Design an enzyme around this catalytic site. Structure first.
Site, PDB file in Angstrom:
ATOM      1  N   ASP A   1      33.429  38.029  49.708  1.00  0.00           N
ATOM      2  CA  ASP A   1      34.345  37.483  48.714  1.00  0.00           C
ATOM      3  C   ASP A   1      34.414  35.980  48.919  1.00  0.00           C
ATOM      4  OD1 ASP A   1      37.293  36.385  48.283  1.00  0.00           O
ATOM      5  OD2 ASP A   1      36.978  37.946  46.777  1.00  0.00           O
TER       6      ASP A   1
ATOM      7  N   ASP B   1      33.952  37.212  42.068  1.00  0.00           N
ATOM      8  CA  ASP B   1      33.700  36.599  43.369  1.00  0.00           C
ATOM      9  C   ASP B   1      33.520  37.625  44.485  1.00  0.00           C
ATOM     10  OD1 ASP B   1      36.537  37.295  43.850  1.00  0.00           O
ATOM     11  OD2 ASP B   1      36.493  35.782  45.426  1.00  0.00           O
ATOM     12  N   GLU B   2      33.242  38.885  44.153  1.00  0.00           N
ATOM     13  CA  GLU B   2      33.229  39.944  45.153  1.00  0.00           C
ATOM     14  C   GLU B   2      32.014  40.843  44.998  1.00  0.00           C
ATOM     15  OE1 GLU B   2      37.503  41.624  45.249  1.00  0.00           O
ATOM     16  OE2 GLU B   2      37.468  39.850  43.942  1.00  0.00           O
TER      17      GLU B   2
HETATM   18  C1  LIG Z   1      44.069  36.445  42.103  1.00  0.00           C
HETATM   19  C2  LIG Z   1      43.587  35.800  40.972  1.00  0.00           C
HETATM   20  C3  LIG Z   1      42.299  35.278  40.943  1.00  0.00           C
HETATM   21  N1  LIG Z   1      41.778  34.617  39.809  1.00  0.00           N
HETATM   22  C4  LIG Z   1      40.388  34.024  39.714  1.00  0.00           C
HETATM   23  C5  LIG Z   1      40.231  32.651  40.368  1.00  0.00           C
HETATM   24  C6  LIG Z   1      39.989  33.066  41.804  1.00  0.00           C
HETATM   25  O1  LIG Z   1      39.368  31.995  42.580  1.00  0.00           O
HETATM   26  C7  LIG Z   1      39.040  34.248  41.657  1.00  0.00           C
HETATM   27  C8  LIG Z   1      39.515  35.398  42.523  1.00  0.00           C
HETATM   28  O2  LIG Z   1      39.073  35.340  43.861  1.00  0.00           O
HETATM   29  P1  LIG Z   1      40.098  35.787  44.998  1.00  0.00           P
HETATM   30  O3  LIG Z   1      39.461  36.490  46.143  1.00  0.00           O
HETATM   31  O4  LIG Z   1      41.236  36.703  44.326  1.00  0.00           O
HETATM   32  N2  LIG Z   1      40.943  34.439  45.391  1.00  0.00           N
HETATM   33  P2  LIG Z   1      39.993  33.131  45.716  1.00  0.00           P
HETATM   34  O5  LIG Z   1      38.528  33.345  45.857  1.00  0.00           O
HETATM   35  O6  LIG Z   1      40.334  31.955  44.668  1.00  0.00           O
HETATM   36  O7  LIG Z   1      40.640  32.633  47.063  1.00  0.00           O
HETATM   37  P3  LIG Z   1      40.449  33.484  48.395  1.00  0.00           P
HETATM   38  O8  LIG Z   1      39.420  34.699  48.126  1.00  0.00           O
HETATM   39  O9  LIG Z   1      41.865  34.210  48.706  1.00  0.00           O
HETATM   40  O10 LIG Z   1      39.973  32.603  49.492  1.00  0.00           O
HETATM   41  O11 LIG Z   1      39.239  34.724  40.302  1.00  0.00           O
HETATM   42  C9  LIG Z   1      42.572  34.500  38.730  1.00  0.00           C
HETATM   43  O12 LIG Z   1      42.167  33.932  37.714  1.00  0.00           O
HETATM   44  N3  LIG Z   1      43.871  35.019  38.745  1.00  0.00           N
HETATM   45  C10 LIG Z   1      44.389  35.669  39.854  1.00  0.00           C
HETATM   46  O13 LIG Z   1      45.535  36.117  39.830  1.00  0.00           O
HETATM   47 MG   LIG Z   2      37.793  34.893  46.764  1.00  0.00          MG
HETATM   48 MG   LIG Z   3      38.682  38.407  45.390  1.00  0.00          MG
END
Ligand SMILES: Cc1cn([C@H]2C[C@H](O)[C@@H](COP(=O)(O)NP(=O)(O)OP(=O)(O)O)O2)c(=O)[nH]c1=O
Ligand SMILES: [Mg+2]
Ligand SMILES: [Mg+2]
Length: 341
Positions: free
Chosen positions: A7, A105-106
């Site tokens: 991720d 992203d996963e």
């Molecule tokens: C949780 C969430 C994610 N997103 C989008 C932008 C995030 O970067 C991506 C989700 O990846 P993530 O694993 O939920 N969060 P992240 O990659 O930004 O940060 P990290 O994985 O916690 O390091 O998709 C949203 O648009 N609304 C959200 O509520």
């Molecule tokens: Mg992420």
């Molecule tokens: Mg994620």
DNA sequence: GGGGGAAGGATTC
DNA sequence: ATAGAATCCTTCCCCC
């Protein structure tokens, strides 16, 4: 079975950095502006500098800007990250044939037939973290365990730019000392509906009569938790098939007037059909978000595909039905298309 | 009893 | 009273 979970770290913001490397070191925030009032919208993601001070996904931008006015606030270019994301996933398709792409992203990877213990799985994690960093210049986080769920918890601890392996004895450890709200798939409404019966960790699921547990969270979540607590959770890495396509837009004012809402709904149908991409649907759902932010929906299925002009027609009828049988004001209108051929 | 459509619910990212 | 998108499950309901 050994699942390798990946991720990306603060994905949307990081892309903004590798595309404009000066953003580095500052607190960055990627926003979804709705347009209603300028700075109305939510925060998609924020980098870990900004995240340190409380900027998180789902917060209003208006509440983000009060905390960091001089942080950079960029509008989302999902168009871009999607192309960036697709390039990264072609990189993972070379490390296993059996890969589930869980989101933007996963990805999950079945590496049972390419490594045989965790030491080489860990090393193959580093193999992947680097080929990402060279090809496309992105840091990611790697979880490693025996099924999809525990490789996901593995990665949540290791964020950011971290790699984690969950062995079978710490699996047994975590069932014992993992606070239950952190298990994937239970948010805050379900989280304390288990605190309200004392369940704080996975173990306690076995020590509670099943019918009382099922009677409140439902049957599927019950077996899910119990099987997780018995070290008997198995669901395979499956190629994901999109089941739903849709678009939904915020209107500039709340309205119950059929013909001012019409252009948005029409605009949502046009955009949804572009994204359909030669897949013909049988079901259409007109979905509205209310003023109090409830979600109302009306649907219809057909023995045949839907054409754009047929979609236009029925959508109004379903939208009509919404305000006939509910009398709040609508804020965001949109459509979803299901049941493809 | 349970499959299947419709609506709400909860969770995810 | 703040986005946008996608998924699975539950509950009532029709029907066999
Ligand atoms: C949780 C969430 C994610 N997103 C989008 C932008 C995030 O970067 C991506 C989700 O990846 P993530 O694993 O939920 N969060 P992240 O990659 O930004 O940060 P990290 O994985 O916690 O390091 O998709 C949203 O648009 N609304 C959200 O509520
Ligand atoms: Mg992420
Ligand atoms: Mg994620």
């Amino acid at each position: 079975m050994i699942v390798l979970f990946v991720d990306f770290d603060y994905f949307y913001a990081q892309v903004e950095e590798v595309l404009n490397p000066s953003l580095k070191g500052k607190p960055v925030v990627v926003c979804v502006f709705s347009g209603r009032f300028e700075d109305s919208g939510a925060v998609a993601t924020a980098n870990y500098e900004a995240r340190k001070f409380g900027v998180k996904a789902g917060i209003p931008i208006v509440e983000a800007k009060k905390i960091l006015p001089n942080a950079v606030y960029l509008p989302m270019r999902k168009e871009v990250y999607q192309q960036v994301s697709s390039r990264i996933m072609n990189l993972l398709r070379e490390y296993s044939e059996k890969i589930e792409i869980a989101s933007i992203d996963e990805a999950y990877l079945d590496i049972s037939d390419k490594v045989r213990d965790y030491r080489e799985a860990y090393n193959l994690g580093l193999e992947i973290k680097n080929k990402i960093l060279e090809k496309e210049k992105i840091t990611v986080t790697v979880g490693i365990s025996k099924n999809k769920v525990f490789a996901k918890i593995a990665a949540d601890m290791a964020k950011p730019n971290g790699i984690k392996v969950i062995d079978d004895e710490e699996v047994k450890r975590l069932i014992r000392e993992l606070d239950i709200a952190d298990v994937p798939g239970i948010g805050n409404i379900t989280a304390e509906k288990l605190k309200k019966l004392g369940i704080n960790k996975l173990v306690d699921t076995l020590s509670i009569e099943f019918d009382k547990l099922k009677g409140m969270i439902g049957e599927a979540k019950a077996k899910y938790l119990i099987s997780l607590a018995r070290d008997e959770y198995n669901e395979p890495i499956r190629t994901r098939v999109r089941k739903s396509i849709g678009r939904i837009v915020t209107m500039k004012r709340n309205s119950r007037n059929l013909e001012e809402i019409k252009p948005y709904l029409f605009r949502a149908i046009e955009e949804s059909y572009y994204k359909l991409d030669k897949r013909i649907p049988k079901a259409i759902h007109v979905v509205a978000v209310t003023e109090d932010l409830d979600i109302v929906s009306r649907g219809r299925t057909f023995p045949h595909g839907i054409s754009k002009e047929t979609a236009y027609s029925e959508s109004v009828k379903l939208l009509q039905k919404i305000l006939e049988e509910d009398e709040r004001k609508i804020r965001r209108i949109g459509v979803r298309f299901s049941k493809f051929i």
